[PDB]
Design a protein around this ligand. Structure first.
Ligand SMILES: Nc1ncnc2c1ncn2[C@@H]1O[C@H](CSCC[C@H](N)C(=O)O)[C@@H](O)[C@H]1O
Ligand SMILES: Nc1ncnc2c1ncn2[C@@H]1O[C@H](CSCC[C@H](N)C(=O)O)[C@@H](O)[C@H]1O
Lengths: 322, 322
């Protein structure tokens, strides 16, 4: 028979050793809080975090998964001999029925640019509905970072047209303005992995989310973000900004998606200006970044960028996730 | 302003040094036929082949391009000082009006699996309508190859689930049958680049197309292809077959897309069986491959595969391009 199933997303998560080991160890570090306790895994996928929770000593784990992949999690649980302690429940966590309130929620809820897919809202729904007073959330907090970037790959792609003459004897340097309009003259957030070679100033933390804190659900609807200021390291074409995040598992173990840190499947969310802007050492850059639900679709990330480069006037660019 | 323009396809072609240099040199090698003559470039894109033709001494080149990219070709022609000899004409070659019949047609018409996009039909339309008797077609011929494959990347992806236990202490080996159904249990042609590490038997030429030959247009409609037979090199999981092509520029310069030869942007067209089949040294494999227009859409490649592995019965699998 023929099927159509998608599977690349799950292989990307398990092949992400930074992601998977950070959760394994973040859960294990909370052994004392989890031993003999009950856990809700929100969006359990193929089930690995629920098993990690049982291996940290959880008495009972409720693995709630809305997509079709829940059946694989049920088989994974059985293969590991845990069917009597880890229960896989299909459907959205907003309507699942558990037999009891839980001592802890674990969830891999982060999307691209942290909030693309808006899954944090389901975790917070579950916290209100099912988490006992003073219960544990894993991870417990998230931080958002921004840095100006000179994207070396983008620089190469754009300049390559002016290199055609040296390789084939045909001048194509006019394709560079065309490529710039196509590659930068759009308002889509681009998900791409960078390295420190791309980072043009010290990264700035622009927001911090404590997931258990009162009022976070309303802050997500109104926009998460803040102002930033930095000074460029040296002369380069500024292509725009990268946004990334970290989350923290309390003891604290930090899972980072910085381009300065080991690569992860989340990569970074890139906010390209309409064209490159030349900067120099100590060029001041300031701005404000706000992460928002899209009006059409609360699960599609919108990012509003306000930015000022050196002496140029402040500009605004309103992005939505690709 | 914001635009939406796609550009990755053109940067892929120019970054393909095998493709671009083979055309540059294939055209230059035909200097004697082209000097002081007229040329039609079918599907001129950003225009580089038309300029190569002028640099080989063509008197006049008609660069016909249907897509929006024709305007960039006009600018490229002007940047190279050739506006008086290379004329860029927008629209389909089937309805363009040239002022004269031409001495030669050059075209980069090959798609994935050679015939995906069915552009060869436009070249042959132009040959009938505009090419002088005894005129030159560049390239002049194409050949199609098939080989059984053991796709090492696919093998890794499928087996990785049984490796999760050794890295995280959670058994996920049941995800392997799920991944196999998702990655192989479909009827899509998959475009992927292989190497000789993937090739499981001597590649077999199964068809040859002389582009100037009578009756080729009807052969494209009825199906291009043929039978093949080979003997496996050694023990491996057979995952199916790769199809690739070469084209020849007469003097002869061969542009090959074999996995044994330098990589190109055409990669190879992979025909996966529904699940891996174990083979051994000297396991005989035979079959038949036919490249067809899809019934819904003549520009989408269909491939009908008949195959017999060792003592197993002959099987059939009907693929269409992803
Ligand atoms: N409201 C909701 N209720 C239950 N599951 C949800 C949900 N929203 C998203 N999901 C699921 O949450 C998962 C997030 S990816 C997390 C994957 C999981 N930790 C694993 O190891 O595979 C996805 O599988 C998605 O289907
Ligand atoms: N019937 C037709 N008439 C004119 N152009 C066509 C065509 N069918 C396809 N094309 C064009 O043929 C091109 C094939 S890709 C060839 C690209 C070109 N040699 C370059 O150097 O860029 C595409 O640009 C496509 O738009």
């Amino acid at each position: 028979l023929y099927y159509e199933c998608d599977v690349s997303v799950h292989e990307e998560m398990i092949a992400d050793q930074v992601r998977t080991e950070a959760y394994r160890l973040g859960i294990l570090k909370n052994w004392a809080a989890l031993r003999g306790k009950t856990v809700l895994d929100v969006g359990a996928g193929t089930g690995i975090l629920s098993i990690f929770c049982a291996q940290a000593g959880a008495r009972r784990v409720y693995a709630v998964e809305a997509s079709a992949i829940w059946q694989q999690a049920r088989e994974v649980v059985r293969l590991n001999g845990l069917e009597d302690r880890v229960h896989v429940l299909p459907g959205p966590v907003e309507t699942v029925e558990l037999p009891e309130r839980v001592d802890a929620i674990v969830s891999e809820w982060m999307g691209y640019g942290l909030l693309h897919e808006s899954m944090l809202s389901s975790v917070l729904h579950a916290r209100t509905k099912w988490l006992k007073e003073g219960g544990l959330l894993l991870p417990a907090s998230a931080e958002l970072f921004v840095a100006p970037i000179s994207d070396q790959m983008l620089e190469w792609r754009l300049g390559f047209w002016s290199q055609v003459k040296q390789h084939y004897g045909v001048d194509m340097s006019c394709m560079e303005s065309f490529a710039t309009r196509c590659l930068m003259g759009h308002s889509e957030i681009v998900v791409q992995d960078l390295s420190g070679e791309d980072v043009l100033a010290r990264p700035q933390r622009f927001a911090q989310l404590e997931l258990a804190r009162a009022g976070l659900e309303q802050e997500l609807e109104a926009g998460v973000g803040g102002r930033f200021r930095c000074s460029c390291y040296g002369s380069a074409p500024l292509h725009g900004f990268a946004v990334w995040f970290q989350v923290t598992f309390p003891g604290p173990l930090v899972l980072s998606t910085s381009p300065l840190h080991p690569a992860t499947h989340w990569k970074q969310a890139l906010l390209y200006l309409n064209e490159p802007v030349p900067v120099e050492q100590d060029t001041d850059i300031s701005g404000e970044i706000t992460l928002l639900p899209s009006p059409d679709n609360p699960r599609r990330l919108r990012i509003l960028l306000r930015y000022k480069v050196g002496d140029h006037e402040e500009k605004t660019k309103d992005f939505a996730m690709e």
